[PDB]
Design a protein around this ligand. Structure first.
Ligand SMILES: [Ca+2]
Length: 232
């Protein structure tokens, strides 16, 4: 239980150069029929917090803008404690996330690369979700998910995973709510023993949240106080 801090973005004055930004709606709405067009302009730093603002704005044929940012190509880790202190909006159509993808997405694709969603929230739910996605030993898409009640997602909460060669554990405010064994690649989990990079985004619409958007919730702000990675 002795952790050493190996990386952080505290967003004290700006966004570090460890982050790369996506642009646009991607392929079929980032694969989930999302409605937003991602931009760099939707990411700012105010008063020591990263602010991802989703807006009702027309660009590229789309009606919403937001930010999707990642450490891919800059920083990645194999095992560790990954955490962020986040305050997010709660409205119909909202889809904020703090998550990780395997560095090998560029060669094996998704979902074989593996995905660890440290925090996902949709719509106005009074809970948050922690999930892994992968391609198992039978060549089939697999997922394993858990949730925890959070009454005020609009307040800051700490979203964390502890990940080692045996397991991934999910916590909110230090409360354990989900766990997945990756020991010996059980259930075809071999790709979780590789380097993963971090992503932050707020999507608007999509298969999971649905297409009922509260247009009176714009502009909407997702606040990240910090992102920290510790390792043994
Ligand atoms: Ca900060």
């Amino acid at each position: 239980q002795n952790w050493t801090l190996v990386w952080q973005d505290e967003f004290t004055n700006g966004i570090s150069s460890d982050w790369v930004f996506e642009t646009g709606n991607g392929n079929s709405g980032w694969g989930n029929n999302e409605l937003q067009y991602y931009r760099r302009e939707n990411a700012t730093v105010e008063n020591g917090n990263l602010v991802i603002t989703a807006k009702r704005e027309s660009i590229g044929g789309y009606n919403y803008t937001s930010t999707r940012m990642k450490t891919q190509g800059r920083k990645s880790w194999k095992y560790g404690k990954v955490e962020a202190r986040i305050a997010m909006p709660s409205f119909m159509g909202s889809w904020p996330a703090f998550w990780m993808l395997g560095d090998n997405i560029s060669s094996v694709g998704w979902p074989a690369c593996g995905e660890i969603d440290i925090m996902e929230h949709v719509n106005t739910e009074a809970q948050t979700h922690g999930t892994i996605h992968w391609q198992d030993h039978n060549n089939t898409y697999a997922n394993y998910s858990g949730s925890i009640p959070v009454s005020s997602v609009t307040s800051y909460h700490i979203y964390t995973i502890e990940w080692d060669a045996s397991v991934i554990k999910w916590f909110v405010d230090g409360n354990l709510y989900h766990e997945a064994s990756i020991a010996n690649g059980v259930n075809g989990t071999s790709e979780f023993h590789n380097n993963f990079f971090i992503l932050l985004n707020m999507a608007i619409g999509g298969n999971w949240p649905g297409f009922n958007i509260d247009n009176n919730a714009f502009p909407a702000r997702m606040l990240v106080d910090y992102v920290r990675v510790y390792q043994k």
